[PDB]
Amino acid sequence: SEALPDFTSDRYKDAYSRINAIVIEGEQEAHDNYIAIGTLLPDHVEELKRLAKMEMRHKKGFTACGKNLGVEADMDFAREFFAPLRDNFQTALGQGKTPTCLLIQALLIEAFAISAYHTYIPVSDPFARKITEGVVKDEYTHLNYGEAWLKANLESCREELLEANRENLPLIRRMLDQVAGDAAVLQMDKEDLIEDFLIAYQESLTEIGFNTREITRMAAAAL
Ligand SMILES: CCCCCCCCCCCCCCCC(=O)O
Ligand SMILES: [Fe+3]
Ligand SMILES: [Fe+3]
């Protein structure tokens, strides 16, 4: 209780202006990514549209969280934060590389979100806590969607996935490093963020059909 941040302080609002922007930007990117995957999987378009609509609801919810605290979201900072990963997604999209697009959005980004949201909930203000608790359940759904498709297609895309992991897992690690200072002002421990991210991602890779040697090797790419 004494560990809860002072949500009204200038220090908190400053850090929140960047963290809030990143979440808003991320939800919008998630929407765009699922719609984009629909161009690669035309028979999945209705399901992907449903996922994308959920992302827009998350975006509006988190936008409201910033407004509730009297915070103005630093959207330029957020756009720059996502740019490297965004670039890799767009490159894969342009090459028709569906498994790479799904690993980036449905596995890496969803796991990062899940981890972040779980870590934020216990230290969040009462308004944002309700919103975030609602969102987390949806992200499980998104993770499961990506897991299911990759699991069904693993034998044809194994090597591409290893490559996508090698290229993109370090970007998530760099993002975690970049967000850590502001996250700490929000009373979130970077070690919790890293642990819960790796656990979520490891569990998804297990579901997809990777063995321990493979997953240890993949986790090691973050170095
Ligand atoms: C609401 C504040 C939570 C704490 C935020 C800590 C920084 C992590 C930001 C990652 C958000 C990624 C958004 C992806 C959303 C999705 O894929 O549905
Ligand atoms: Fe979302
Ligand atoms: Fe999502």
Q: What is the CATH number of the domain that holds 159?
A: 1.20.1260.10
Total tally of structural domains belonging to the chain? 1
4, part of any domain: no
142, part of any domain: yes
- Evaluated on CA atoms 20, 23, 27, 29, the torsion sign reads positive
72, part of any domain: yes
3, part of any domain: no
For residues 60 and 38, give the distance between their C-alpha atoms in angstroms, rounded to a whole number.
22
Amino acid present at 195: E
126, part of any domain: yes
1, part of any domain: no
Binding site membership of 182 for ligand 1 (Cβ less than 6 Å)? no
Distance from the alpha carbon of residue 135 to the mean position of ligand 2, in angstroms = 7
Other Cβ atoms less than 10 A from the Cβ of 39: the count is: 13
Binding positions are 27, 55, 58, 110, 142
Q: Which ligand is nearest to the CA of 117?
A: 1
Output DSSP code: residue 4.
S
Host domain of residue 16: 9-223
Pair 99, 157: CB distance under 8 Å:
yes
Rg (CA), the chain: 17
Pair 37, 30: CB distance under 8 Å:
no
- Evaluated on CA atoms 156, 159, 163, 169, the torsion sign reads positive
Burial of 102 (0-12, 13-18, 19+ CB in 10 A): buried
* Tokens 């897992």 -> residue: 169
Region of 210 please: left (phi>0), alpha (psi -120 to 50) or beta. beta
The two tokens of residue 154 are 């693993």
2, part of any domain: no
Å resolution of this model?
Answer: 1.8
For residues 217 and 223, give the distance between their C-alpha atoms in angstroms, rounded to a whole number.
11
